[PDB]
Amino acid sequence: PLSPPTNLHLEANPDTGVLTVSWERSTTPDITGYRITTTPTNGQQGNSLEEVVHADQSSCTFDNLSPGLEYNVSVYTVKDDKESVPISDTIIPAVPPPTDLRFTNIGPDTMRVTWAPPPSIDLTNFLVRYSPVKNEEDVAELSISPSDNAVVLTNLLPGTEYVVSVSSVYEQHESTPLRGRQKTGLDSPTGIDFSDITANSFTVHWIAPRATITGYRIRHHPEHFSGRPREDRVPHSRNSITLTNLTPGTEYVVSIVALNGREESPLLIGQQSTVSDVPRDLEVVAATPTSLLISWDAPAVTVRYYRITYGETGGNSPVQEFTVPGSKSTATISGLKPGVDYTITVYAVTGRGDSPASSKPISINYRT
Numbered sequence: 001p002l003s004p005p006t007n008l009h010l011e012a013n014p015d016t017g018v019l020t021v022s023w024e025r026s027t028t029p030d031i032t033g034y035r036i037t038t039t040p041t042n043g044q045q046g047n048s049l050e051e052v053v054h055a056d057q058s059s060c061t062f063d064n065l066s067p068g069l070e071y072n073v074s075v076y077t078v079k080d081d082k083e084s085v086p087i088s089d090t091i092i093p094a095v096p097p098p099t100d101l102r103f104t105n106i107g108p109d110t111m112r113v114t115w116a117p118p119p120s121i122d123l124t125n126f127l128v129r130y131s132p133v134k135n136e137e138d139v140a141e142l143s144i145s146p147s148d149n150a151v152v153l154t155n156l157l158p159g160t161e162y163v164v165s166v167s168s169v170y171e172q173h174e175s176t177p178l179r180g181r182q183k184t185g186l187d188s189p190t191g192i193d194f195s196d197i198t199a200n201s202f203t204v205h206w207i208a209p210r211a212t213i214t215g216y217r218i219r220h221h222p223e224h225f226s227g228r229p230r231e232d233r234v235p236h237s238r239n240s241i242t243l244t245n246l247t248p249g250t251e252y253v254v255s256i257v258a259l260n261g262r263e264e265s266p267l268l269i270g271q272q273s274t275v276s277d278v279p280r281d282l283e284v285v286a287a288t289p290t291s292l293l294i295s296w297d298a299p300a301v302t303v304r305y306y307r308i309t310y311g312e313t314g315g316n317s318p319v320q321e322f323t324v325p326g327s328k329s330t331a332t333i334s335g336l337k338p339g340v341d342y343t344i345t346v347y348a349v350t351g352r353g354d355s356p357a358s359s360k361p362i363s364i365n366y367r368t
Contacts, residue, residue, distance in 0.1 A: 001082075002028045002082060002084035003026045003028045003077065004026060004084040005024060005025060005034065005075045005084075006023065006087060007023055007024035008021070008088075008089050009021070009022040009023065012091055012094060013093075014096070014097070015097065016065055016067030016068070016093040016095070017063050018063045019063070019071075019091070020060075021061070021073055022058060022059040023058055026077035026084065028077060028079070028084075030079065031055050032055055032079050033052055033053055033054050033078045034058075034077060035052045035078050035083070036050065036052070036053070036076075037051075037086075038050075038062050038065060040069060040070065042070075044069075046071070047065060049062055052078075065093050067095055067096050067170070068121075068171065069092065071090065071092075072088055072089070072090045074087070074088040095121075095169070095170050095175035096118030096119075096121060096168060097167060097168050097175035097176045097177065098116055098126065098149075098167075101115050101166065101178050102115075103164075103180065103182040105152070106183075106184065106185055107184065107185055108156075108159070108184055108185045108186060108188075108209075108266075109187070110152060110153060110184070111152070111153050111162070112150055112153075113130075113151050113152075113164050113180075114149055115150070115166045117146070117168065121170070122170075123168050123170055124170050124171060125146050126143070126146065126148070126169065127141065127166070127167040127169050128141070128151050128164070128166050129141050129142075129165050129167070129177070130162050130165070131162065132160050132161065132162055132163075133160075133162065133163050134160075143169075158186055158187035158210050158211035159184060159186045159209075159210075159212050159260060159263070160184050161181055161184075162181065162183070164180055164181070165179040185211075186209060186211045186213060186258050186264065187211050188265045188266045188267065188268045189206040189207055189208060189257075189258050189268045191207040192206050192256065192268050192269070192270035193205040194254075197274065198301065199275050199276065199299075200244065200246045201242060201243060201245070201274070203241065204240060204254050204270075204272075205240040206268055207239070208236075209258045211260070212260060213236050213258040214236050214260050215233060215234050215235050215236050215259050216233075216236075216238065216257065217231055217232070217256070217257050217259055217264075218234070218243075219232075219255045219256075220252050220253065220255070222250045222253075247274065248274055248275070248277045248278065248359065248360070249275065249276030249277070249278065250273060251271055251272070252272055252273065253269065255268070255270075256269075275299070275300045276300070277303075277359035278359045278361070279347075279362045280296065281296055281297045282295070282296035282346050282363065283295055287368065290335055290338070291332060292332070292333045292336060292368075293331070294308070294330070294332075294333065294344055294346075295330050295331075296362065297329060301350060301359075302326065304350060305324060305349050306323065306324040306349065307321060307322075307323055307346070307347040308321060308322055308331055308344065308346050309321040309347075310342050310345070311342065312340050313341035313342060314341070339368070341366065341367070341368070342368065343363055344363055345362070346363070347359055347361050
């Protein structure tokens with residue numbers, strides 16, 4: 001008779017395909033080979049196969065089994081037309097896990113996770129598990145249709161790294177998890193608000209985002225400007241900035257993004273106009289044959305004094321001028337000449353020194 005093989009070893013590749021069968025050779029000399037068989041346990045529909053090796057060979061592979069199913073493997077010692085009793089053992093190949101984990105559509109509180117499902121297998125479903133890297137025990141689970149290859153996670157914490165794993169499932173059998181990490185984006189700062197508005201400046205305020213950031217990049221500009229908009233880069237400790245050197249009575253678009261390294265958040269945008277430093281409603285209140293009592297409305301800024309100029313309309317010759325204290329918005333222009341159209345101009349001088357900052361002019365032409 002023939003002594004059967006002993007020390008049977010069954011090795012099924014996780015991603016079911018190759019199943020290596022190994023054994024200690026028979027102790028009977030003069031035999032001609034070994035025959036191996038794989039059959040679904042208890043008698044079921046699957047892939048019952050067979051393979052034959054030489055006497056000197058002690059291993060064969062079954063690179064064609066059905067994952068997550070049980071098989072009984074038997075190896076027989078063969079000598080021509082005779083065979084030994086077999087050495088049998090049963091194995092359930094592992095469920096193939098999915099592969100190719102891609103993260104797309106990354107938002108501050110959401111992300112789309114895609115995978116490549118195991119080929120040629122009718123899974124029961126997929127099992128997605130995810131949690132914050134620094135909050136492992138805070139895990140959530142999702143069962144996905146076996147016909148789907150993606151999951152859009154939602155209601156996530158901004159600027160937070162999450163661990164995401166997708167597992168294939170068949171009946172009870174779950175595969176190894178297809179794992180990967182992905183950080184959510186930064187949420188935008190909110191509640192842009194402006195204060196301390198002047199003729200050439202204003203303070204911008206904003207509310208910090210939930211995510212951890214290192215600073216902000218504020219950018220501002222009026223409707224039309226030649227080159228690159230002026231920007232400011234501040235530390236995360238700042239929640240306001242006073243923009244200076246702005247032009248009077250000008251509308252500015254201010255944008256703020258939170259930053260963290262090369263990471264940026266979406267924009268928080270707003271608009272704010274600077275106060276106009278130009279006087280208004282300049283007019284002639286009273287008048288005589290050689291004078292005009294003019295009046296105007298002070299601009300919403302502190303004027304040191306006003307500069308009034310007057311000269312014959314279209315005269316082209318030097319204008320005459322004098323000042324008025326900032327506290328008063330009235331003036332009398334004496335010694336004029338009748339039958340002489342006079343262009344009267346008023347400027348709000350707000351600066352000091354030898355070259356005081358003055359507003360743009362406002363004038364009228366008088367009918368006399």
